[PDB]
Design a binder for this molecule. Sequence first.
Ligand SMILES: *P(=O)(O)OC[C@H]1O[C@@H](n2cnc3c(N)ncnc32)[C@H](O)[C@@H]1O
Ligand SMILES: *P(=O)(O)OC[C@H]1O[C@@H](n2cnc3c(N)ncnc32)[C@H](O)[C@@H]1O
Ligand SMILES: [Zn+2]
Ligand SMILES: [Zn+2]
Ligand SMILES: [Zn+2]
Ligand SMILES: [Zn+2]
Lengths: 311, 305
Amino acid sequence: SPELRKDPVTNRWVIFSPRPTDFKSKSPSSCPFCIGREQECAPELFRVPDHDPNWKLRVIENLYPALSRNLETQSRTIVGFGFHDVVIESPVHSIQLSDIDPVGIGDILIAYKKRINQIAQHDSINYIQVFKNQGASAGASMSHSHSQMMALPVVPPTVSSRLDGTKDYFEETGKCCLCEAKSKHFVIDESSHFVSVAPFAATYPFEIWIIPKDHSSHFHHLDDVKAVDLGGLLKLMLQKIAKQLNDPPYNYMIHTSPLKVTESQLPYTHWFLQIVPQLSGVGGFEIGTGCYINPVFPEDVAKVMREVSLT
Amino acid sequence: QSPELRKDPVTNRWVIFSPTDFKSSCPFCIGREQECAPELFRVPDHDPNWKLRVIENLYPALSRNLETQSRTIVGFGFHDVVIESPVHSIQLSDIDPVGIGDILIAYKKRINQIAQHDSINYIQVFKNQGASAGASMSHSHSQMMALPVVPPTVSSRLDGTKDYFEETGKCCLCEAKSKHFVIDESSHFVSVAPFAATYPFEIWIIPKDHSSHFHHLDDVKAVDLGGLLKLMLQKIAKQLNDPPYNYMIHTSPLKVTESQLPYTHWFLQIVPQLSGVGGFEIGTGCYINPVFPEDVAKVMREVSL
Ligand SMILES: *P(=O)(O)OC[C@H]1O[C@@H](n2cnc3c(N)ncnc32)[C@H](O)[C@@H]1O
Ligand SMILES: *P(=O)(O)OC[C@H]1O[C@@H](n2cnc3c(N)ncnc32)[C@H](O)[C@@H]1O
Ligand SMILES: [Zn+2]
Ligand SMILES: [Zn+2]
Ligand SMILES: [Zn+2]
Ligand SMILES: [Zn+2]
């Protein structure tokens, strides 16, 4: 039977309206991002290893940026100042992120952190969205493995909503709701520093959140040990998704603190990584209301995903 | 042109603008009624020769059987289907303004039935046309979903329009002619490309009178709206090569307070389906719109039918 559920992190109701194990995907050899072709890319910010011609990753400016870094002094309407960068995740054209080894994924995570720390030097930036698209229908335009970073001059709606809901919950219980993840959501897998779950009031079917076990407000406070540990758990979730759902397109999104987060917000602000496989679309109900309809309960997603074997 | 962020009290969120070239028998058929979930009413009333029918959805997202039961709440609600034509190949926009009016008056009838239930707080009337816009059936139809809660866009709209009214003493949709980019105008309605439109070629149809509730619509305004809706849908079809689309009626919460009425003003939103989203939108709840509403209005004002 259908149910509405709410969670402080989304701060909204979702409708659950249902077999879970019957859910499946319904979806060049070179390119400018390939090693050797660097002059065909927008300006480089840095690579790993540093200035090594034999690079493992590169962070570059987006050639078609959504926001303009040249509008900084200019700052109903505000100017479209921001940063839009691309993280090229492999020198090799055909390797997908989930095929990269945990240490290599750790290096990407650490590169997000290095770049965030660079952007955080600009007072005009209020939030940085790190995200990945895999698959045309999940918004990828390039087949080569990569992810993107968009730095914004405003705190966007999800972040505002999250701050509001987590604050209300903290005032109500004295607790950070993500510190309570193992009792509040449905655990899937656990690594040394992170736990993956099917979110109690998940927006999307087979949505998974990977959540630091320690209270951590900022993604970019990640260290190298946590990075490789997170890399391994991210890899695992992506490979279980790819097996269970027949390699669907997907997106992942890092949800982190605003750059000007206040001391008072710290106790209930806890970063996490959201993975959303693309399984279904929306129509007029969701557009009209901002309420989603999820056909699979998280109880059931967790059961399924815990039983996934990769051998 | 140069990117820009824009906000509107109605959405109460920033959108990033970052830029004429933009482009895209069954069980509901007259003679197949026993094959549907229970009929609620039809038009003409009890006429075997129906022009529209309002039925229960066969696969409802919320359960009408959970009313007595009501971080979790029971999935009580009403999920209904409005069948807009007895004829299988007719699209909504092909219907004459009066017939579209009838459909709008039927939405009104059904809202007033639903509003008799204290457990309902908001009713979303919406249409999907085309598989990729969420349609599962090609016969012309729209839907209504009655909810036990006020959903996020409605809460956001109430907040944003409240803020604006507190700062200006004005209802922002009452000023639509000076705030938004006018496309067409009827006797009681105006259609605009919204200043801070979420989606490329989004169009709002706004009542010119300050009207808080859709369902206070009368017969004259229904036919007037019908003709303007038809005009926008036909212009969209022609300019954008008949894309799939959605429309959504934005209206007041059923338990709206007196103090909310001065800045609460219903409207109808039309979204041609032209593009999709990626991790930026999912992560932030901020959209990126490739066409300024200035350019949309200019293109749309020139469409010849
Ligand atoms: P994914 O498909 O999520 O995003 C790809 C982004 O890469 C940008 N882009 C395309 N081509 C180039 C070059 N040559 N250099 C730098 N950036 C590039 C697109 O604008 C996408 O946003
Ligand atoms: P559109 O494609 O937006 O939505 C169609 C809705 O109609 C419901 N439905 C399908 N078939 C039937 C019957 N035989 N009776 C009543 N309702 C029906 C689908 O569940 C869609 O919600
Ligand atoms: Zn390549
Ligand atoms: Zn915490
Ligand atoms: Zn039919
Ligand atoms: Zn008004």
